[PDB]
C-alpha cells in the first residue's frame, strides 16, 4: 500500500549499511585543540557552531524534509569528546554482537589516531570516572548498580514543542537578548545568567545557519533539475529551510521540518538519547486541518509522517560495548505521543491521530517509540485501531493509562493541567512535556545482587570479597520477617552508595558538560537564564532503574513456604545449595520451583511480596534527593540487563540457576505465569501501581491465531482495560509465533520486518543477538484470558 | 662594604639583559592544545603542574636560595594564555621605551609570534573584552576610566605566612584531603568545593615536585664541586628543597626558601603581581634568634636577606604597551612589611628589623617595596634608623601610620587584633595579611575628565559625541554650588558605568580564570572550599584608583574666584577660553593661574573643595558593592597615568593647558606648593584623611643639602610625626639632587643605581623614558619645613 517514494526512503534506512562518521569527531577534535580560555559553556556553543558550519550534508532524491545526522544515509555520529569507552572499546567498534557498524574506508585509523588517542584521558567520561570511590568499583563490577550518565550528557530533553511550533527560534533568541539587556551583574555568580543566554543565542543562530545550508543546497539542486515535480519539491524545501526553525511554521511540512531540525540539532550537540517529540497529533492539528480543507488528500500528510518517522529511525546513539549488549538494537527512546486528553479532560483524539495510526498500519519503524495515551473517554474507534496496528504490523504503539500517569505526576508536584500534557523521555517514565528535566539514567539498581550479598552477610561469592555489611548471619533468622529486615538493612547501604555516585555525577555535569540546544525550549531555562545542568527546569527527578522484581518476589515466597512453614530445609542448607549451584540436589531445586507459588499467577501468598519490595525500594531511595533537589523514583525495568546482570548473580532461592538471566523487566519469570494475562496484570496490581512514579515496564506476548480477527481485539482490549481499571500504567504487546521467530533465525533475509518490543523500545528481530533472541522466545505465549 | 657574593649576585640581576623566555609560553600553549572536557579549574592546576615538571631550571654558583622565574638570569616569563595585548603589541615588545626587553635568537618569530597567533582571539583578555558595552568604548577611549584586571588574574595575593611558616604545604594538603573525605555532594553546586580542594592539592604537590627538581640539581652540582664551602652550601640547598615548602622550615634559610618558593610559584601560575611577602621581621624572628644564639653572625643573615631581596627584584610582570608607559619601570608592588605593633598594641620592632634596615643601608633594590609601619610607641632607634636609610639611599622604607590604617581597616569590618597585622597588596592600600582579597585594579577613574564632560553638558568635544548626560547648561549656574551639583550628576553617571564594568569583569574571572596557588593560604579558601574568585576570602574590597585631585581642587577654586566672586568672566566665556586652550588670552590664563589660591599651601579657600570632592567620590561609589560583596574604597593615586590621562583632558579652569600632565597622585601640581612641605600635609588634612580607606599616595622630595646630618634624623622626624598626628597615612620621600638627576641622563651607565620613588613603586631612574623622567624632575623640591 505504501507510496513508491516511501518505499525507497524506507529501503535506504533499513538497508544502507551503517557507517561510522568522522565529520563530527574530526571537527570537534580540531576545535578543542585550539587553545582557549573562553568559558567552557561559550566554547561549547562555538564548537557546535563550527561543527554545523563545516560538516557534510546531502539531500536525497526522495526526501521532502531536509537533514540527516551524517552526510550520507545511515551515518553513525561519534562523540570522542564525551565517551571514554571509545578508547577502551575501540577495537570491537566494528565487530559488535548487537550493533552492526562498519568503517567507510580504513579511516578507522583517522579515528584510532588523530582523535580517540588525542582525547585519551580527557573525555567527559574520564572526568566522570574520577567520581567513583574505590569501594564502589567492586559494586559496579558485580552489577549491584551501573554508573549512568557517565559516558553521555544528561540527555532526556523535552522541548516545549506546543509553544515552539507557534514562535520559532527567533522568539527565544529575542527573549535571551531582552533578558541580557535588563540583567545586572552584581555578584560573581550572576555571570551564570550571562553565559547561559549568550550560549543559547549562539547555538540557536547556529541551527538557523545549518538550515540555511540545506536551503542553499536545495536551491542549487533545484536549478539543475529537469523533473518539474522534484524541482518543486526542492524549491519548497529551500523555502522551508529559510522559513523554519527561525520562524513559526506556516505549513504542515514546515512544522514537521521545524521539529525535525530541532530534534536533529539536539542529537548532534552531545552524546545522549531519550529526547521526545511531543504530542504530534496535537501541535500539528491546525496545519492538517487547514491544508486538508484546502484540498490536500490524506496521502499528502501520510508521506510526510512516514519520512518524518524514518528521519528518526535512521538515528543512532552508540554506547559503550557493554551497554550495547544490555541495550541491544540501540534504543533511542524518542517518543511521539498520541491520543490522551486536552487541558479540560475531554478526548484529544482527532483525525490526525487516525491518519498517523493508519501510517503505522502500512509501515512500522523501529523508532520512534509511539506512545498511545488511553483514558476513560478515549474514542473507541481510535483506541481499537491502535490495538489493530500493535498486533498486525507489530512493534508500536505501547499503551499507557492517563489516569495512572496523572496520579504519578500530581504526586511529583505538577498541577492538574500540566499533568494532562504528559509524555516520556526514556522507556516508560511519565513527565510533563516541555517542563521537565527528567533524569532517566542515574543508573540501575539490582535488588537480586543485594539479596545475594545479604544471603552471605555481606561477602560476595562471585568476586569473593566483603562489599556489603553484616545484615545478620543466616542461622539467626526466625522468620521470613527476619530475613526481610536483614534485606532492608543491606538494601539501605547499597542504595546509598548508588545515590552518592549518582548525585556526584549529576553535579559534575554542572561543571563540565552543558546541553545548550536541549535547554533552549525547556521551560525555565530561558526565563531563569540557567541551562539545564544549572537547575534551569522547574522540575527535576531521577528514576532508579530497578532491574526486576519477579526473581526477588519468587525467591521470598520460596523461602517462606519452603524454609519457615514446611521446614524442608534450614537456611544454612540453602546457601550451601545456592553456593553449590544445586550440583546434585536437583530434586530439591524442583521443590523450590514447584512447591512454592510463583509471581504472576494471581496467588496472594507470593503476590504479597510485590507490595513489600516496591515499598522498601521507594522508601530507601526517598531518604535522599537528587543533585537538583528532586525525588528519586521507582522504575522497574531491565532492558537486556536481566541477561547481563543475571550473569553475575549466583543461584537464587526461587530455583533460578547461577548466571542465568533474571525475569524480563517487571514481568513474571519465564515459565511461571501459567494462568493467562488477566492473572499476570492482576498480580502486578498487588504492587499498588499508584506507587512507582516512573512506571512498571510490562511485556506481554500473544499467540497470533487466538487474538486474530475482531474478537481477537476484544480479547486484547479486555486484558488492557482490566489492567487500567486496577491503575495499571503501561502494557506492551508482541503478537508473534514461536515458529515465526525461528524462521527469522534460520532465514533472517526473509523476515527483516518482524518488529519486537524489547523493553520500552522496539527493534528488528534480525538485528538482535542470538542470545537476546532466545530470551525473547522464552517469553510466555498467552493463549487467552 | 657588601659581601663579594652579594656584589656578584647583585650584578647578575642589575646587568644581565632581560630576555623574553619561552618555557611557559611553549609548555602552556602545548598543554591547552590537548583537547579536554576536564573542568577548567582542574585543567589549570594540571597545566600548572605540567609546566613546573618541564621548565628549565638553573642554580647560580653564588646562590644559597633556589628558584628563578626562568632558566637563566633576568628571564621574562610570558602569559599568552591570559594577555590579549601580546598580539596587538607583539611588534613593540622588544622596542619598549620603559621596559627594554630582548629576544635571544630569532625566537621573536621562533615560537613566540607563532604561539601568540595560536592564542589569537582566545586569551582571557579576549573574553574580558566581550564584557565592554558599546557605549563604554568611547568612555575608555577618552580615558574617563580604565578596564582593570582585563589582562591579568585577580592577582593581589596575600598568603598567611604567619601560619604558613609554621605548617608548610603538607598541613594544607592534609586539610584539603580531610575536608574532601567529609564532604557530601547533595546539590549540583556542591561540586564547586570538590573542585577547589582537588585543585589546591594538585597545585601544592606540583610546587613540592618542583622544589625536588632543585634538590636533585643541587645534589648533582654538589658531587662535581671541588670547593668545600660551595659543596656544603649545595648540600644544604638540596636538603632545604627536600624540606620546604612541603614541611615547616627549621632554619632561617629554609623559612626564606619556603617564602620564596611560594611567592615564586604564585607568580608563575597566572599573570599579574602585587603579591605581598608579609611581615618578614616578624615571622622570621624565631629562626634568627635561635641561630644567633648558636653563634651565626649578623653577616650570615644579611647575605640571605640580600639574595632574597634580589630574588624578587629579578621578577617581571609585563603589561600591555599602554599600562607599560603609565606604569614605567615595571612595578611589581610586592611589599615586605617591617615594624608596627604586635597583636596587643605593643611595638613589634626587634633586632631583625634593624638587621633588615642595615641591609637596605648597604644595598637598595627596586623591589620589594618596603613599608615601615610607624606607630606612637615605635622604637626610637629603629624608627630613626629607617629614616636615615630612606635618605642615604634609593629611599625605600616608605612610612605608614598604623593609627590611620587601623582606623581604615576597622571601618572595613576587621577586628582590632586583625587590623594590627596589616600590610599592602598594591601601592599603599591597607589590608589584613593572610585574610584579605583586595582588588587593587578595578580600574582608574578620571574625575577631571568627568569634569570636562560636565562643562560641556554631557559632550566630549574632541570626539563630538554626547557620551555623558545632561548635568545642566553652564549658562544657568547661579553659584559655585550650581556647578558642584552639576558635576555630581555627571560623576554619578560615569561612576555607575565604571562599577558596572568592574563588577562584570570580576564576575568574569569566576568562570574563566582561577588563581589556585594564591588561594591556598588565603584564610577562608581551604576552610570553605572556594578559590578566591568564588568568594573564598572573608574580606573583599576594591580600590578605585582616582587619577589625582589637585587640578579638580584648583579648578573649582579658580571658578569660585574669577567667575562668581570677581566676575572676571561668565561660564560660557570660561568654556570658550578652555575650548581654545587660552589662545590669545594668556592674560586670562594668568588670572586663573594666580588670582586664585592653589592646593598644598594651607589656604582654606581652596582646601575646602578637597573635602567636597573626596566626599563626592566616596558617596558615589558607596551606592554599590563589588561582585564579591565588598565596598568600593577611594585610592587617590595617579601613578604615571597623570601623563597619559592628562593628554585626554582639555584645558581646565586652574590654568592647566590641553594635553598637559595632571598633578601626580595625591600631591599638588608642579609649581603650586610654594610654602614648604609642612603646608602640603596640612592641606591634605582638609581631605579628612580618615575617609579615603585605601589611602592617598603622597610624594615628597627634599633638597639633599638641607636634611643632612643628625639635624636631619632630627628634622626628618619633624615633618613625619606632624603628618601622623594629623592622621596622615603615607609619607614616602625621595632625596635626589635635581642637578644629580640631570647629570644622570648624560652619563646613564654612571648612575645605574639611582633609585627614585615614583608613585608607590620605586625604580632606577636610568630605566625610565625621558618624558617620565623630566616629569619626575618637575616635582617640588622642599628646602625645609
Ligand atoms: O539508559 C537510558 O537511556 C534510560 C532509559 C530507561 O528509561 C532507563 N535507563
Ligand atoms: O594596577 C595595579 O596593579 C594596582 C596597583 C595600585 O593599587 C594601583 N593599581
JSON list of N, CA, C and O and ligand atoms in Angstrom, two decimals, chain B residues 155 274 319 333 426-427 429 440-441 444 635 639, ligand 2:
[
{"chain": "B", "resi": 155, "resn": "UNK", "atom": "N", "xyz": [44.91, 38.44, 40.84]},
{"chain": "B", "resi": 155, "resn": "UNK", "atom": "CA", "xyz": [46.21, 38.66, 41.48]},
{"chain": "B", "resi": 155, "resn": "UNK", "atom": "C", "xyz": [46.08, 39.14, 42.93]},
{"chain": "B", "resi": 155, "resn": "UNK", "atom": "O", "xyz": [45.32, 38.57, 43.71]},
{"chain": "B", "resi": 274, "resn": "UNK", "atom": "N", "xyz": [51.54, 42.33, 42.56]},
{"chain": "B", "resi": 274, "resn": "UNK", "atom": "CA", "xyz": [51.02, 42.89, 43.80]},
{"chain": "B", "resi": 274, "resn": "UNK", "atom": "C", "xyz": [50.87, 41.85, 44.92]},
{"chain": "B", "resi": 274, "resn": "UNK", "atom": "O", "xyz": [50.04, 42.02, 45.81]},
{"chain": "B", "resi": 319, "resn": "UNK", "atom": "N", "xyz": [53.25, 44.21, 31.27]},
{"chain": "B", "resi": 319, "resn": "UNK", "atom": "CA", "xyz": [51.91, 44.68, 30.94]},
{"chain": "B", "resi": 319, "resn": "UNK", "atom": "C", "xyz": [51.85, 45.13, 29.47]},
{"chain": "B", "resi": 319, "resn": "UNK", "atom": "O", "xyz": [52.87, 45.16, 28.76]},
{"chain": "B", "resi": 333, "resn": "UNK", "atom": "N", "xyz": [55.09, 45.85, 42.94]},
{"chain": "B", "resi": 333, "resn": "UNK", "atom": "CA", "xyz": [54.29, 46.20, 44.11]},
{"chain": "B", "resi": 333, "resn": "UNK", "atom": "C", "xyz": [54.20, 45.02, 45.08]},
{"chain": "B", "resi": 333, "resn": "UNK", "atom": "O", "xyz": [53.13, 44.66, 45.58]},
{"chain": "B", "resi": 426, "resn": "UNK", "atom": "N", "xyz": [49.41, 46.08, 46.36]},
{"chain": "B", "resi": 426, "resn": "UNK", "atom": "CA", "xyz": [49.16, 47.27, 45.57]},
{"chain": "B", "resi": 426, "resn": "UNK", "atom": "C", "xyz": [50.18, 48.32, 45.91]},
{"chain": "B", "resi": 426, "resn": "UNK", "atom": "O", "xyz": [51.31, 47.98, 46.28]},
{"chain": "B", "resi": 427, "resn": "UNK", "atom": "N", "xyz": [49.82, 49.60, 45.81]},
{"chain": "B", "resi": 427, "resn": "UNK", "atom": "CA", "xyz": [50.81, 50.63, 46.13]},
{"chain": "B", "resi": 427, "resn": "UNK", "atom": "C", "xyz": [50.76, 51.03, 47.60]},
{"chain": "B", "resi": 427, "resn": "UNK", "atom": "O", "xyz": [51.80, 51.01, 48.25]},
{"chain": "B", "resi": 429, "resn": "UNK", "atom": "N", "xyz": [47.47, 50.58, 49.70]},
{"chain": "B", "resi": 429, "resn": "UNK", "atom": "CA", "xyz": [46.17, 50.26, 50.29]},
{"chain": "B", "resi": 429, "resn": "UNK", "atom": "C", "xyz": [46.34, 49.31, 51.46]},
{"chain": "B", "resi": 429, "resn": "UNK", "atom": "O", "xyz": [46.98, 48.26, 51.31]},
{"chain": "B", "resi": 440, "resn": "UNK", "atom": "N", "xyz": [43.17, 45.65, 43.83]},
{"chain": "B", "resi": 440, "resn": "UNK", "atom": "CA", "xyz": [43.84, 46.94, 43.65]},
{"chain": "B", "resi": 440, "resn": "UNK", "atom": "C", "xyz": [43.59, 47.50, 42.26]},
{"chain": "B", "resi": 440, "resn": "UNK", "atom": "O", "xyz": [43.84, 48.70, 42.04]},
{"chain": "B", "resi": 441, "resn": "UNK", "atom": "N", "xyz": [43.06, 46.69, 41.36]},
{"chain": "B", "resi": 441, "resn": "UNK", "atom": "CA", "xyz": [42.90, 47.09, 39.96]},
{"chain": "B", "resi": 441, "resn": "UNK", "atom": "C", "xyz": [41.49, 46.84, 39.44]},
{"chain": "B", "resi": 441, "resn": "UNK", "atom": "O", "xyz": [41.30, 46.14, 38.44]},
{"chain": "B", "resi": 444, "resn": "UNK", "atom": "N", "xyz": [41.20, 52.69, 37.03]},
{"chain": "B", "resi": 444, "resn": "UNK", "atom": "CA", "xyz": [41.28, 54.08, 37.47]},
{"chain": "B", "resi": 444, "resn": "UNK", "atom": "C", "xyz": [40.07, 54.85, 36.96]},
{"chain": "B", "resi": 444, "resn": "UNK", "atom": "O", "xyz": [39.40, 54.45, 36.01]},
{"chain": "B", "resi": 635, "resn": "UNK", "atom": "N", "xyz": [41.15, 55.48, 46.48]},
{"chain": "B", "resi": 635, "resn": "UNK", "atom": "CA", "xyz": [42.60, 55.46, 46.41]},
{"chain": "B", "resi": 635, "resn": "UNK", "atom": "C", "xyz": [42.96, 56.62, 45.49]},
{"chain": "B", "resi": 635, "resn": "UNK", "atom": "O", "xyz": [42.76, 56.53, 44.28]},
{"chain": "B", "resi": 639, "resn": "UNK", "atom": "N", "xyz": [49.64, 57.34, 39.78]},
{"chain": "B", "resi": 639, "resn": "UNK", "atom": "CA", "xyz": [50.80, 56.68, 39.20]},
{"chain": "B", "resi": 639, "resn": "UNK", "atom": "C", "xyz": [51.34, 57.61, 38.12]},
{"chain": "B", "resi": 639, "resn": "UNK", "atom": "O", "xyz": [51.32, 58.83, 38.29]},
{"chain": "C", "resi": 2, "resn": "LIG", "atom": "O1", "xyz": [47.23, 48.31, 38.57]},
{"chain": "C", "resi": 2, "resn": "LIG", "atom": "C1", "xyz": [47.62, 47.82, 39.67]},
{"chain": "C", "resi": 2, "resn": "LIG", "atom": "O2", "xyz": [48.34, 46.75, 39.68]},
{"chain": "C", "resi": 2, "resn": "LIG", "atom": "C2", "xyz": [47.24, 48.50, 41.04]},
{"chain": "C", "resi": 2, "resn": "LIG", "atom": "C3", "xyz": [48.35, 48.81, 41.73]},
{"chain": "C", "resi": 2, "resn": "LIG", "atom": "C4", "xyz": [47.90, 50.08, 42.68]},
{"chain": "C", "resi": 2, "resn": "LIG", "atom": "O3", "xyz": [46.94, 49.71, 43.66]},
{"chain": "C", "resi": 2, "resn": "LIG", "atom": "C5", "xyz": [47.31, 50.87, 41.83]},
{"chain": "C", "resi": 2, "resn": "LIG", "atom": "N1", "xyz": [46.52, 49.86, 40.87]}
]
